[PDB]
């Protein structure tokens, strides 16, 4: 298990986020029309897993869409914005609005994803939600960047994620 | 299991909804402020579990709030509006705001509730959501009325539920 912070308060997160070098575990998640989406449907693309406690917070942080946009301007890249929000709530997400190759996916019937990817919050009020995390997977499903964000309300190292994506 | 319908197509619902005469099982669900709420916190009251596939569909039918208000106009009655939507989304529901004794509750980290109450959609695109159902529990924690609604988009027999609460 890992420790992150919320309102600078400590939060346990299950297991261990995948490390660069490792093979990405397969998953199934749910798209905005309630269809099932698997990692294998993105075979040969680079994938960013952009993992949030919620994407239904009612505030549209500029940094979210900025990263999503920069990431998908790199050829052969998809960004998967993942959270425990139901598809009904993700359908109006502002960070995917107006951007191709940015897809929202929900964990509501696939809780094993959050365990497998080391991002399941295990205690406190946010128990059951995902931690803030970014995971970059290459064309052959190898992890090439991961970060479990130390303060859930602050930005990931987008600059570092984008550098891996290009390089 | 049980079979209901969604826009006329058959939908499997796990286990069996509790029937009149059944003992109400304890449960824990999550409130709008991410706190845990249990059945035992309503000891001494009659409780109506008003169970929805989602309360964030973008459409608020007038029949929903009407029932909630009529029910809570009966002395010693609370209405628990229950769904898989996260607490973040349950703020867009039209049927609880401004009505005392009408409370929204989420199943998002208590999936066992939907199993125990025979309301877990087991197949199809709605898998993981609750079926539409009404369960009325009395002061002895006995179930005195229940209905697993045949067509998930259509109203329960609110008249029958209200009658059981009066008598």
From Swiss-Prot, chains A, B:
- Disulfide cysteine pairs (residue numbers): 60-94
Q: Which reaction does it catalyse?
A: a hydroperoxide + [thioredoxin]-dithiol = an alcohol + [thioredoxin]-disulfide + H2O
Does the keyword field hold Nuclease? no
What keywords appear on the UniProt entry? Antioxidant, Cytoplasm, Disulfide bond, Oxidoreductase, Periplasm, Peroxidase, Redox-active center
EC number(s) reported in the record: 1.11.1.24
Q: Where in the cell is it found?
A: Periplasm; Cytoplasm
Q: Which residues form the active site?
A: 60
Matches recorded under Pfam families: Redoxin
Q: Which biological processes are named by the entry's GO terms?
A: cellular response to oxidative stress
Enumerate the spans annotated as Thioredoxin domain.
Answer: 18-167
Give the main localization category. Answer: periplasm
**GO MF terms, alphabetically ordered:** hydroperoxide reductase activity; thioredoxin peroxidase activity
A Gene Ontology cellular-component term: periplasmic space
Keyword Hydrolase: yes or no?
Answer: no
Protein family per UniProt: Belongs to the peroxiredoxin family. Tpx subfamily.
Matching HAMAP family, A to Z? Tpx
The task this protein performs is described as: Thiol-specific peroxidase that catalyzes the reduction of hydrogen peroxide and organic hydroperoxides to water and alcohols, respectively. Plays a role in cell protection against oxidative stress by detoxifying peroxides. Has a preference for alkyl hydroperoxides and acts as a lipid peroxidase to inhibit bacterial membrane oxidation. Acts as a principal antioxidant during anaerobic growth.
**Additional observations:** The active site is a conserved redox-active cysteine residue, the peroxidatic cysteine (C(P)), which makes the nucleophilic attack on the peroxide substrate. The peroxide oxidizes the C(P)-SH to cysteine sulfenic acid (C(P)-SOH), which then reacts with another cysteine residue, the resolving cysteine (C(R)), to form a disulfide bridge. The disulfide is subsequently reduced by an appropriate electron donor to complete the catalytic cycle. In this atypical 2-Cys peroxiredoxin, C(R) is present in the same subunit to form an intramolecular disulfide.
How the protein assembles, per its UniProt entry? Answer: Homodimer.
Descriptive protein name: Thiol peroxidase
